[PDB]
Amino acid sequence: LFRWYLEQHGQLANFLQAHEHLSWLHEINSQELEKAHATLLGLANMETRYFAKKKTLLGLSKLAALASDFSEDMLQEKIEEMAEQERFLLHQETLPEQLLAEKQLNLSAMPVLTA
Amino acid sequence: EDRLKIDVIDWLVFDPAQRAEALKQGNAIMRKFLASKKHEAAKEVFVKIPQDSIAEIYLPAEDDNAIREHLCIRAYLEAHETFNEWFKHMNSVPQKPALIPQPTFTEKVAHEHKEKKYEMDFGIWKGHLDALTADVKEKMYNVLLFVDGGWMVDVREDAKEDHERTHQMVLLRKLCLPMLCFLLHTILHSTGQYQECLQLADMVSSERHKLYLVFSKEELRKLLQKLRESSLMLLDQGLDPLGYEIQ
């Protein structure tokens, strides 16, 4: 597996190599949505290198969870604990377009900033 | 009965003092046709509405919404006029030169040229494509991200009850927003814009639009098996699932 990553039926070995962070992929495929949601949120959290990407993962996590089969209670929890994440992010999101050309910042190719 | 309805429009358009009623009724009629996807029907009605109707009419809650609905409908139509052109083009790619194995020295040169001309056309058919892709995309984001309250969503909230229309406006959103998303995904995938494909999961889930409520659970998964497909091609290119360099 570590000798496949360093480098059809190669997608059946991709099915097994997708074990690890590529998890969510073979999880959407296996129709394991709830599972895809857990790892999609987990990869959203560790995410610090790219803002545009931390934003994409949550969106996916969320669309995974919504499309999954949680009870209306559990679902309401996933989307509330989520609504929080989106709430912090929205901050870096609404950064004015005057200071982001002043500070000569990359639009999307910038990091996940902290409070 | 199609004609009965598309003909009652010219009667209301004739008298300029009923332009507010002509538009409103034009909307209703076009709401029935949209639910059937009769776009040549909807548009044949859409032209009967004088291009300067909006200007003159200038506001009851019933006229503010019908003006908004009309433009929403134009935003929708234009999002199918430009796709069918784009789509028609995607299916007219220059064909490779035919090979004549064991060629005469005559056939060798005719082919050195047919092979050099094709390597000019395929460049333009990506040229015209890019410009039809840049244009069809814009339209699909004008509908999906409709300004000031989402598509087919009233901004005015003080009109009198019209359950027929209101529920016609919820439905039109559930038939056409899942269908426009899947198209845009097909456009982005067809042109190899895979990073952006995956960014349909931001647009949809967004709390700014709440587009995900217009989706059935099944449609979602389907959109999630569409994105996992763009992702693959991004791995084949050597990038991570979402298109970002693997450091």
PDB file of N, CA, C and O in Angstrom, chain B residues 1-14 21-22 25-26 29 48:
ATOM      1  N   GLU B   1     -54.197  22.573 -25.483  1.00  0.00           N
ATOM      2  CA  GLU B   1     -54.534  23.720 -24.645  1.00  0.00           C
ATOM      3  C   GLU B   1     -53.367  24.691 -24.502  1.00  0.00           C
ATOM      4  O   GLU B   1     -53.521  25.784 -23.956  1.00  0.00           O
ATOM      5  N   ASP B   2     -52.201  24.280 -24.987  1.00  0.00           N
ATOM      6  CA  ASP B   2     -51.012  25.126 -24.972  1.00  0.00           C
ATOM      7  C   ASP B   2     -51.286  26.492 -25.604  1.00  0.00           C
ATOM      8  O   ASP B   2     -50.971  27.534 -25.021  1.00  0.00           O
ATOM      9  N   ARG B   3     -51.879  26.482 -26.794  1.00  0.00           N
ATOM     10  CA  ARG B   3     -52.176  27.718 -27.518  1.00  0.00           C
ATOM     11  C   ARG B   3     -53.159  28.631 -26.779  1.00  0.00           C
ATOM     12  O   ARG B   3     -52.986  29.849 -26.765  1.00  0.00           O
ATOM     13  N   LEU B   4     -54.187  28.044 -26.172  1.00  0.00           N
ATOM     14  CA  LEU B   4     -55.177  28.814 -25.422  1.00  0.00           C
ATOM     15  C   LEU B   4     -54.504  29.750 -24.430  1.00  0.00           C
ATOM     16  O   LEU B   4     -54.928  30.890 -24.238  1.00  0.00           O
ATOM     17  N   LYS B   5     -53.443  29.253 -23.808  1.00  0.00           N
ATOM     18  CA  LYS B   5     -52.761  29.979 -22.748  1.00  0.00           C
ATOM     19  C   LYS B   5     -51.741  30.974 -23.291  1.00  0.00           C
ATOM     20  O   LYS B   5     -51.692  32.123 -22.855  1.00  0.00           O
ATOM     21  N   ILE B   6     -50.933  30.536 -24.249  1.00  0.00           N
ATOM     22  CA  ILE B   6     -49.937  31.412 -24.857  1.00  0.00           C
ATOM     23  C   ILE B   6     -50.595  32.495 -25.716  1.00  0.00           C
ATOM     24  O   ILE B   6     -49.949  33.469 -26.110  1.00  0.00           O
ATOM     25  N   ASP B   7     -51.888  32.330 -25.987  1.00  0.00           N
ATOM     26  CA  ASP B   7     -52.633  33.297 -26.798  1.00  0.00           C
ATOM     27  C   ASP B   7     -53.353  34.341 -25.947  1.00  0.00           C
ATOM     28  O   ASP B   7     -53.646  35.438 -26.417  1.00  0.00           O
ATOM     29  N   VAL B   8     -53.633  33.998 -24.695  1.00  0.00           N
ATOM     30  CA  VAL B   8     -54.270  34.935 -23.780  1.00  0.00           C
ATOM     31  C   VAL B   8     -53.285  36.034 -23.377  1.00  0.00           C
ATOM     32  O   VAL B   8     -53.671  37.035 -22.777  1.00  0.00           O
ATOM     33  N   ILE B   9     -52.014  35.836 -23.721  1.00  0.00           N
ATOM     34  CA  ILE B   9     -50.961  36.802 -23.406  1.00  0.00           C
ATOM     35  C   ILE B   9     -50.963  38.011 -24.339  1.00  0.00           C
ATOM     36  O   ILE B   9     -50.806  39.148 -23.890  1.00  0.00           O
ATOM     37  N   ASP B  10     -51.143  37.763 -25.632  1.00  0.00           N
ATOM     38  CA  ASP B  10     -51.181  38.839 -26.618  1.00  0.00           C
ATOM     39  C   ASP B  10     -52.384  39.748 -26.396  1.00  0.00           C
ATOM     40  O   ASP B  10     -52.368  40.922 -26.770  1.00  0.00           O
ATOM     41  N   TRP B  11     -53.436  39.202 -25.791  1.00  0.00           N
ATOM     42  CA  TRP B  11     -54.632  39.976 -25.472  1.00  0.00           C
ATOM     43  C   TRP B  11     -54.360  40.950 -24.328  1.00  0.00           C
ATOM     44  O   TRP B  11     -54.869  42.069 -24.320  1.00  0.00           O
ATOM     45  N   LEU B  12     -53.546  40.516 -23.369  1.00  0.00           N
ATOM     46  CA  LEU B  12     -53.207  41.334 -22.205  1.00  0.00           C
ATOM     47  C   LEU B  12     -52.058  42.295 -22.496  1.00  0.00           C
ATOM     48  O   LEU B  12     -51.935  43.342 -21.856  1.00  0.00           O
ATOM     49  N   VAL B  13     -51.212  41.927 -23.456  1.00  0.00           N
ATOM     50  CA  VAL B  13     -50.094  42.767 -23.875  1.00  0.00           C
ATOM     51  C   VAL B  13     -50.568  43.939 -24.735  1.00  0.00           C
ATOM     52  O   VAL B  13     -50.014  45.036 -24.668  1.00  0.00           O
ATOM     53  N   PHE B  14     -51.600  43.695 -25.538  1.00  0.00           N
ATOM     54  CA  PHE B  14     -52.158  44.705 -26.433  1.00  0.00           C
ATOM     55  C   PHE B  14     -52.480  46.009 -25.700  1.00  0.00           C
ATOM     56  O   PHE B  14     -52.138  47.094 -26.174  1.00  0.00           O
ATOM     57  N   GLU B  21     -50.629  43.071 -15.235  1.00  0.00           N
ATOM     58  CA  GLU B  21     -51.416  41.845 -15.232  1.00  0.00           C
ATOM     59  C   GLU B  21     -50.932  40.891 -16.321  1.00  0.00           C
ATOM     60  O   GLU B  21     -51.041  39.673 -16.187  1.00  0.00           O
ATOM     61  N   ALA B  22     -50.400  41.458 -17.398  1.00  0.00           N
ATOM     62  CA  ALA B  22     -49.837  40.668 -18.485  1.00  0.00           C
ATOM     63  C   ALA B  22     -48.579  39.942 -18.027  1.00  0.00           C
ATOM     64  O   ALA B  22     -48.373  38.771 -18.344  1.00  0.00           O
ATOM     65  N   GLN B  25     -49.536  37.228 -15.284  1.00  0.00           N
ATOM     66  CA  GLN B  25     -50.128  36.063 -15.933  1.00  0.00           C
ATOM     67  C   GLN B  25     -49.115  35.348 -16.822  1.00  0.00           C
ATOM     68  O   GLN B  25     -49.153  34.125 -16.958  1.00  0.00           O
ATOM     69  N   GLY B  26     -48.213  36.115 -17.430  1.00  0.00           N
ATOM     70  CA  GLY B  26     -47.146  35.545 -18.236  1.00  0.00           C
ATOM     71  C   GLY B  26     -46.262  34.662 -17.377  1.00  0.00           C
ATOM     72  O   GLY B  26     -45.823  33.592 -17.806  1.00  0.00           O
ATOM     73  N   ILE B  29     -48.193  31.326 -16.477  1.00  0.00           N
ATOM     74  CA  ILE B  29     -48.158  30.467 -17.650  1.00  0.00           C
ATOM     75  C   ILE B  29     -46.784  29.831 -17.842  1.00  0.00           C
ATOM     76  O   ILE B  29     -46.677  28.649 -18.176  1.00  0.00           O
ATOM     77  N   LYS B  48     -43.174  37.522 -26.249  1.00  0.00           N
ATOM     78  CA  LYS B  48     -44.430  38.252 -26.359  1.00  0.00           C
ATOM     79  C   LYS B  48     -44.483  39.392 -25.349  1.00  0.00           C
ATOM     80  O   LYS B  48     -45.129  40.416 -25.584  1.00  0.00           O
TER      81      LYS B  48
END
